[PDB]
Scaffold this active site. Structure first.
Site, short mmCIF file in Angstrom:
data_model
loop_
_atom_site.label_atom_id
_atom_site.label_comp_id
_atom_site.label_asym_id
_atom_site.label_seq_id
_atom_site.Cartn_x
_atom_site.Cartn_y
_atom_site.Cartn_z
CG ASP A 34 -2.16 1.17 1.15
OD1 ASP A 34 -1.84 1.54 0.59
OD2 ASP A 34 -2.38 1.61 2.62
CG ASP A 220 -3.25 4.45 -3.22
OD1 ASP A 220 -2.58 3.54 -2.41
OD2 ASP A 220 -4.50 5.08 -2.76
C1 3LL Z 1 -3.15 7.86 5.43
C2 3LL Z 1 -4.10 6.96 6.92
C3 3LL Z 1 -4.51 5.87 6.75
C4 3LL Z 1 -4.92 4.29 6.51
C5 3LL Z 1 -4.83 3.46 6.13
C6 3LL Z 1 -5.28 1.94 6.77
N1 3LL Z 1 -5.63 0.68 6.36
C7 3LL Z 1 -5.75 0.94 5.38
C8 3LL Z 1 -5.86 2.03 3.90
C9 3LL Z 1 -5.60 2.76 4.46
C10 3LL Z 1 -6.31 1.64 2.83
C11 3LL Z 1 -7.26 2.98 2.18
O1 3LL Z 1 -6.83 2.91 1.31
C12 3LL Z 1 -5.33 2.43 1.54
N2 3LL Z 1 -4.35 3.33 0.01
N3 3LL Z 1 -5.44 2.00 1.33
C13 3LL Z 1 -6.29 0.25 2.58
C14 3LL Z 1 -6.67 -0.82 1.49
C15 3LL Z 1 -7.33 -1.95 1.15
C16 3LL Z 1 -7.38 -2.53 -0.23
C17 3LL Z 1 -9.29 -3.47 -0.10
C18 3LL Z 1 -8.87 -3.45 -2.00
C19 3LL Z 1 -8.32 -3.74 -2.94
N4 3LL Z 1 -6.87 -2.98 -2.64
C20 3LL Z 1 -6.62 -2.18 -0.99
F1 3LL Z 1 -5.70 -2.07 -0.87
C21 3LL Z 1 -7.66 -2.74 2.50
C22 3LL Z 1 -7.39 -2.58 3.52
C23 3LL Z 1 -6.76 -0.81 3.98
O2 3LL Z 1 -6.79 -0.72 4.79
C24 3LL Z 1 -3.29 6.83 8.54
O3 3LL Z 1 -4.45 7.28 9.24
C25 3LL Z 1 -5.47 7.56 7.95
#
Ligand code: 3LL
Length: 368
Positions: A34, A220
């Site tokens: 990520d 992203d």
């Molecule tokens: C900057 C801050 C953050 C955060 C954050 C935390 N947990 C996350 C994510 C972001 C995701 C959401 O968007 C992004 N870029 N990462 C994410 C995408 C997914 C996900 C789901 C489906 C397909 N691809 C993915 F990456 C899964 C799980 C997931 O968990 C710190 O305070 C805000």
């Protein structure tokens, strides 16, 4: 870097994951890659969706930081217990480092039912780390503790099982054709960039370019779609509608609220326009453009419209990245784009990275 080639896996719409190990002896976990967050967080309890989870009790190198972390994001939330432990990437560099790990003890809408990943690897910068920027991100620890060069690159290949490569500490030139073109990282928090011009089928939208970057634009890997600011999304759809007016679609389709389906083997790719984003270049008044196809923004589910509106700006997600080999050149504060050796394309149109172009007032495109 042949050992790192093909080290990413995934399912359509569920992200790309890399194998990692945590603790001593090593516990293997699949971890979502990520570039849009900055915490390393792993399942630490037997949630029914999980194939496995981090068992701190089995790790002699585990250290408790006696501090919690709570992370609500737009689409879900997780909470955990901070610690450090020894972490490695089997199909990465041959090193082991002591990293911060959030042991996830409660979550909502974070884990996906039927997915094969158990945690998240936040590759962005400390400024957006939780609870604050004193919690050193994984990649920072990796670079600080080893001689791994301060860069990584991603080839996301798409299809349903998807695949790709994360090259840690370098670039594999077999993964791209032509030249890399670089856009500056405006600020080290998200991987923020500046879009200076947008064309649909060669046709400029003619918006104040500030709009393309309101309030930011980021690269992203953890977002599936190309997301766009409303005002920009409104204009973008208007022109895509007109370009594709050969055939008619409901209003919900454009909002990603209903699918459109064609009979198998007969989708009209060619009625849909290409999308070109011009990015700020390395030199004053110089830009370049990346160009994607409908195969990137029309996603199999029947297809979904994978461009959507945003309240937090443009997000160049997997729709953009699957066209290109993307180099996160942290050392030089820049992101490189090149045509990916694995991107999906028809016989008539292919993804492109082209330059140089002359673009004036590019600094006025950034929102402050
Ligand atoms: C900057 C801050 C953050 C955060 C954050 C935390 N947990 C996350 C994510 C972001 C995701 C959401 O968007 C992004 N870029 N990462 C994410 C995408 C997914 C996900 C789901 C489906 C397909 N691809 C993915 F990456 C899964 C799980 C997931 O968990 C710190 O305070 C805000």
């Amino acid at each position: 870097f042949v050992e790192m080639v093909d080290n990413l896996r995934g399912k359509s719409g569920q992200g790309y994951y890399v194998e990692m190990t945590v603790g001593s002896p090593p516990q293997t976990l699949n971890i979502l890659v990520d570039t849009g967050s900055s915490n390393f967080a792993v399942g630490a309890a037997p949630h029914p969706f999980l194939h496995r989870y981090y068992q701190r009790q089995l790790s002699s190198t585990y250290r408790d930081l006696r501090k919690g972390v709570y992370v609500p994001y737009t689409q879900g939330k997780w909470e955990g217990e901070l610690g450090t432990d020894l972490v490695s990437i089997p199909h990465g560099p041959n090193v082991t480092v002591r990293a911060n790990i959030a042991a996830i003890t409660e979550s909502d809408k974070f884990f996906i039912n039927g997915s094969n990943w158990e945690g998240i690897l936040g590759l962005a910068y400390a400024e957006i780390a939780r609870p604050d920027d004193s919690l050193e991100p994984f990649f920072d620890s990796l670079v600080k503790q080893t001689h791994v060069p301060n860069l990584f690159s991603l080839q996301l290949c798409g299809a349903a099982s998807v695949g790709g490569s994360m090259i840690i500490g370098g670039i594999d030139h077999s993964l791209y054709t032509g030249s890399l073109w670089y856009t500056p990282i405006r600020r080290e928090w998200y991987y923020e960039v500046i879009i200076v011009r947008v064309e649909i089928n060669g046709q400029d939208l003619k918006m104040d370019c500030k709009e393309y970057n309101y309030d930011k634009s980021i690269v992203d890997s953890g977002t599936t779609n190309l997301r766009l600011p409303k005002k920009v999304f409104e204009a973008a759809v208007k022109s895509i509608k007109a370009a594709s007016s050969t055939e008619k679609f409901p209003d919900g389709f454009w909002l990603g609220e209903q699918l459109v389906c064609w009979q198998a083997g007969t989708t009209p790719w060619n009625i849909f326009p290409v999308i070109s984003l011009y990015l700020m270049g390395e030199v004053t008044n110089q830009s370049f453009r990346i160009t994607i196809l409908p195969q990137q923004y029309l996603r199999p589910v029947c297809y979904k419209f994978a461009i959507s509106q945003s309240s937090t700006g443009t997000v160049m997600g997997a729709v953009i990245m699957e066209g290109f080999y993307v180099v996160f050149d942290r050392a030089r504060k820049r992101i490189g784009f090149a045509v990916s050796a694995c991107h999906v394309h028809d016989e008539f149109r292919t993804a492109a990275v082209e330059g140089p172009f002359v673009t004036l007032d590019m600094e006025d495109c950034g929102y402050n």
